[PDB]
Every structure is written in structure tokens, then in C-alpha cells.
Amino acid sequence: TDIINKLQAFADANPQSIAVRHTTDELTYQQLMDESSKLAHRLQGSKKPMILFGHMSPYMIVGMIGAIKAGCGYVPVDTSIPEDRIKMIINKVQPEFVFNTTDESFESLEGEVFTIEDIKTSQDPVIFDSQIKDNDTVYTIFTSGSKGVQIEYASLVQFTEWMLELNKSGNKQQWLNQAPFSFDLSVMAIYPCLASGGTLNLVDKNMINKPKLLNEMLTATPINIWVSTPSFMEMCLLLPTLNEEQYGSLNEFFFCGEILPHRAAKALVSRFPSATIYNTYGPTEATVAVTSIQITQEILDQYPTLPVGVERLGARLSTTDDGELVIEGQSVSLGYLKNDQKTAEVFNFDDGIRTYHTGDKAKFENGQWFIQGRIDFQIKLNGYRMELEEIETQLRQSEFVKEAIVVPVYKNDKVIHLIGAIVPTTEVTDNAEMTKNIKNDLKSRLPEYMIPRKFEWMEQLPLTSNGKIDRKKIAEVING
Numbered sequence: 001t002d003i004i005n006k007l008q009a010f011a012d013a014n015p016q017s018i019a020v021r022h023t024t025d026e027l028t029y030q031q032l033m034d035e036s037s038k039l040a041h042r043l044q045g046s047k048k049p050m051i052l053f054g055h056m057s058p059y060m061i062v063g064m065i066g067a068i069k070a071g072c073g074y075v076p077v078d079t080s081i082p083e084d085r086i087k088m089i090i091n092k093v094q095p096e097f098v099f100n101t102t103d104e105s106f107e108s109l110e111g112e113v114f115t116i117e118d119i120k121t122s123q124d125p126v127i128f129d130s131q132i133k134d135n136d137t138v139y140t141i142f143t144s145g146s147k148g149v150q151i152e153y154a155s156l157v158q159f160t161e162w163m164l165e166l167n168k169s170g171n172k173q174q175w176l177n178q179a180p181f182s183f184d185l186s187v188m189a190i191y192p193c194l195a196s197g198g199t200l201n202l203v204d205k206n207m208i209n210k211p212k213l214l215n216e217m218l219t220a221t222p223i224n225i226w227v228s229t230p231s232f233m234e235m236c237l238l239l240p241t242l243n244e245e246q247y248g249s250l251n252e253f254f255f256c257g258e259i260l261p262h263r264a265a266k267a268l269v270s271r272f273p274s275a276t277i278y279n280t281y282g283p284t285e286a287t288v289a290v291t292s293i294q295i296t297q298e299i300l301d302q303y304p305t306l307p308v309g310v311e312r313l314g315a316r317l318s319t320t321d322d323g324e325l326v327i328e329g330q331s332v333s334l335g336y337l338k339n340d341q342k343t344a345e346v347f348n349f350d351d352g353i354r355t356y357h358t359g360d361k362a363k364f365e366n367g368q369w370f371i372q373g374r375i376d377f378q379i380k381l382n383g384y385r386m387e388l389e390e391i392e393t394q395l396r397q398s399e400f401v402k403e404a405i406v407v408p409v410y411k412n413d414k415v416i417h418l419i420g421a422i423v424p425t426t427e428v429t430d431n432a433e434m435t436k437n438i439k440n441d442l443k444s445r446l447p448e449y450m451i452p453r454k455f456e457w458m459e460q461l462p463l464t465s466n467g468k469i470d471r472k473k474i475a476e477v478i479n480g
């Protein structure tokens with residue numbers, strides 16, 4: 001089981017099945033393989049990764065498959081990344097080639113920028129031997145910035161095989177992707193979908209910002225398998241039609257990247273009693289995710305906050321005696337690109353074993369891992385210590401809060417109090433009373449000093465470009 005081989009076998013079985021769909025733009029398995037070989041011909045000899053630029057054109061997938069076959073790999077760059085960071089990336093990468101999959105012109109200080117047109121009308125042969133090997137760097141994905149992470153081809157093959165076993169909805173399914181391709185969550189949709197003959201359906205930024213457009217896309221395609229961040233799922237729960245009775249095609253979900261709120265999982269389990277729902281956790285540095293747990297009624301009833309589950313093959317998890325989880329194994333990245341200090345500082349791979357220090361406080365209780373917080377988001381107030389996420393979880397377990405993020409406030413380089421930005425369960429008609437009620441509701445769940453002074457009621461929490469809660473942008477609304 002090899003990525004190119006399963007895709008090619010499926011393309012040979014069903015050349016006219018759709019491999020990729022972005023609104024009306026469709027790409028069949030035959031064209032995905034045809035155009036990917038043509039790109040590989042233009043790409044061969046290249047021992048530098050191909051920059052992959054665009055948003056949601058199906059030719060981004062062409063780019064990925066082409067970069068795999070030529071063996072040089074790719075660096076996915078989404079149009080939502082600021083231009084100066086794009087310049088920084090192309091500069092670090094030293095590409096020979098840049099695939100501009102958008103309609104507008106792109107130009108790059110390094111390498112040859114070509115368009116889809118160069119491939120649509122290329123005359124190069126449509127058969128090309130894949131020359132990737134296990135230890136090649138298949139992709140380099142850059143960190144959010146909350147450095148380019150390098151991933152071995154074998155890590156990807158392994159990760160996809162894991163997703164294929166976790167998948168209970170079979171082959172030839174309609175898959176949904178939300179993550180931009182510069183966010184490795186999309187990998188969790190791209191390759192398990194193509195490796196099982198599915199159709200990768202692309203949600204773009206516009207759909208994320210204008211939910212009526214998302215609703216339209218959902219009505220045009222009956223989605224079966226859904227891969228997204230928890231925050232995106234939370235937003236889509238406000239589509240009332242999105243339930244098992246009215247949208248019965250949808251029966252499997254994979255979430256990664258953020259804490260999955262117990263309330264959100266509860267609602268989804270309620271509205272799709274038959275769906276296979278997985279919570280997964282992992283950093284970019286260990287190939288997308290390393291744990292999974294199926295969320296059921298029992299998992300909900302029995303776990304006040306959800307675990308992230310058990311480790312996968314290629315990922316041996318251990319916990320340092322301060323609680324920092326460490327991942328060892330094939331899932332571990334080779335390291336950040338031409339950034340030796342940043343690599344030494346969290347990566348230890350000596351004697352051929354590979355280890356990554358995660359920065360998340362994790363705890364293992366009765367067969368299951370829990371992610372409690374990012375080490376940085378730990379506060380001492382009144383000489384006491386909780387993880388910011390824990391405070392936020394306590395706020396979410398309150399009938400007046402539908403969603404909540406907590407902002408520490410500082411001076412003289414030390415936290416002074418907390419402000420809670422709240423999406424309330426009800427529009428907050430009155431200002432004094434809700435502050436009163438949230439604080440009183442907290443008497444049970446929090447020691448006084450960890451209850452925020454202020455609340456800032458927000459209609460909606462802003463999301464990052466990757467679909468996570470935008471902490472920085474939430475800070476700015478509070479800070480003046």
C-alpha cells in the first residue's frame with residue numbers, strides 16, 4: 001500500500017469518477033493522474049521542493065500528486081498567507097519551480113512561475129514513473145506562527161493507512177475538506193479520500209465567511225465524511241438543516257487542531273446518532289495527528305471533557321515528569337528547514353530514533369490521553385496555577401455561555417486579572433445581570449481568583465485563516 005499506487009488503481013477502475021470538486025470546477029481521477037504526470041515531466045530532475053500556490057483550485061491537488069511523482073515534494077502556500085511571509089518562505093525554500101494555480105499573475109524571486117495553462121496544454125506524456133522514496137521529504141508545511149515542518153513520505157503513507165482503517169464509511173465517499181492546504185489538517189482529508197476513491201469536496205474561504213454559500217455547497221453535494229476544525233464544526237451547527245434526518249448522507253466526522261468542546265460534541269452526537277465521530281490530536285511536527293477516539297454517547301456521558309484517545313502506529317507517546325507529552329517514532333518530522341536552532345530545541349533524533357517535545361500538558365488516565373493546555377497558556381494568579389484552557393472549559397460548562405475565550409491582562413510582565421470574551425447562549429439583553437449570573441454560576445466550578453473580573457460579550461468569535469479560534473484578534477478587541 002503506496003499512495004500513488006492506490007490512487008492509480010482507482011483511476012484505472014473509474015477514470016470518470018470525480019476525484020476533486022470545488023464548486024462547479026471538477027477533476028476526474030483520470031485527469032488528476034494525467035495532469036499530474038504532465039507536471040511531473042516538467043518537474044523532473046528537481047531536487048528542490050515545488051512551491052504550491054493557490055487556494056482551492058483542484059489543480060492544487062494536481063500539484064501535490066505531481067510533486068510526489070517527481071520525488072521533489074512540495075511546499076503548500078495558501079492565498080491567505082500574508083505576502084511578506086510568502087516571500088520569506090520562497091526565500092528559505094530556494095525553489096526551482098512555483099505552481100501558480102490562481103488566475104492572477106504571481107512572480108517569485110526564486111524559480112520559474114508557471115500556471116495551470118502550462119499543464120492543460122502541455123504535450124508531455126501522461127505516464128510517469130513515480131520516483132519518490134520512503135525517506136524523501138514529501139511536503140514542508142509552515143507553522144502558523146501562534147518555520148517549515150518537514151515530513152517523510154513514509155510518515156504520510158503510514159498516516160493515510162491509519163485514516164483508512166479509522167474510516168468506517170468505505171470507499172467512493174463524498175469527503176469534505178475545510179483546512180487550507182497550508183494547514184496540515186487538509187492532509188487528513190486529501191490523502192485518505194484519494195486513497196479510497198472518494199471525491200474531495202473543497203470548502204473555500206468565501207464559504208467559511210458567508211454561510212449561505214456553505215449551505216448551498218452542502219445542498220449541491222451530499223457529504224458523507226467531514227474533516228474540519230472544531231470551531232468550523234461549531235459554526236456549521238448553526239445551520240438548522242444540518243442533522244441526520246435532513247442531511248442523511250453525512251455519517252462520519254474527523255476533527256483536529258483544537259479542543260473539541262463537550263457541548264459541541266454533545267450536539268453533533270444528538271443530531272447524528274448514527275455518525276462515526278472521531279476526536280483526534282496531534283501537532284504538525286508529528287504528521288497531522290497521533291491519537292483518535294470515537295466520541296459516543298458513552299464517551300460523552302462518562303467524560304466531562306473529552307479525551308483525545310490512544311496513540312497510533314508510528315507515534316509512541318510518553319509524558320515527561322512535568323507533564324509535557326513527547327512523541328517518538330515514524331510520525332515525527334525530520335525537522336524544520338534550514339533552522340538548526342529551532343530544531344535542536346524541541347527535536348531529539350539520535351541513534352535513528354525520532355522524538356518531538358510537544359509543549360502541551362498531557363495526562364494519561366485509564367487508557368486515554370487528555371490534552372489539558374498549551375504550556376504557554378498557563379497562568380499564576382494568587383500564586384495558583386491553571387491552564388487557560390481549563391478556565392475556558394469551566395466557562396463553557398454554564399448555561400449562559402455558548403462559547404468562551406479568556407484573556408490574561410498584564411503589567412510589569414505579570415498577569416493582573418482575566419477578562420472573559422463570551423458568546424452567550426442568549427443575546428445579552430442586559431449588561432449588569434449577565435456578569436452577575438456568569439460569576440455566580442462559577443461559584444461551583446472555579447476558585448474565586450480564577451474567575452474573571454470582566455466579561456466582553458461577542459456575537460461571534462473570530463477565526464484564524466486555518467479555522468481555529470483567533471486568540472490574537474480576540475486580544476485586540478479587549479486591549480483598548
Ligand SMILES: Nc1ncnc2c1ncn2[C@@H]1O[C@H](COP(=O)(O)OP(=O)(O)OP(=O)(O)O)[C@@H](O)[C@H]1O
Nearest residue numbers: 143144145146256257258259280281282283284371
Ligand atoms: N484534539 C485536540 N485537543 C486539544 N488540543 C489540540 C487538539 N488537536 C490539536 N491541538 C493543539 O494544536 C496544536 C497543534 O497545532 P498546529 O500544529 O496546527 O499549530 P500550532 O502549534 O497551533 O501553531 P504553531 O504553528 O505556532 O506551532 C497542538 O500542539 C495542541 O496544542
Ligand SMILES: [Mg+2]
Nearest residue numbers: 143283284285
Ligand atoms: Mg506547533
